[PDB]
């Protein structure tokens, strides 16, 4: 991987995680840095297939009506946690 592969791994991530999040900043999306603290931490109130449907589903949308990517992927994160029905 890139730059952010072993930043995200400190970061308290899981491998496989990281795996798919350091490709995210690699293909001309958002930046690494663009995430706010609350993203950071939220990220660990996540199990591994947890964080990794929120992975799928944050590439599967749409960037291009998005400013604070920070805001957007914690929109996602919120409905994942938020699953009672």
Known sequence: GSENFQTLLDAG????????????????????SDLDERAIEALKEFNED?????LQQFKD????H??????????????????EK
């Open 13 to 32: 991530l899981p491998q496989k995680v990281a795996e798919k999040l350091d490709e995210i900043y690699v293909a001309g999306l958002v930046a690494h």
């Open 50 to 54: 947890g964080a990794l449907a929120v």
């Open 66 to 83: 998005v400013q604070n990517k920070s805001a957007f992927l914690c929109g996602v994160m919120k409905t994942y946690r938020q699953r």
């Open 61 to 64: 949308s749409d960037l291009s």
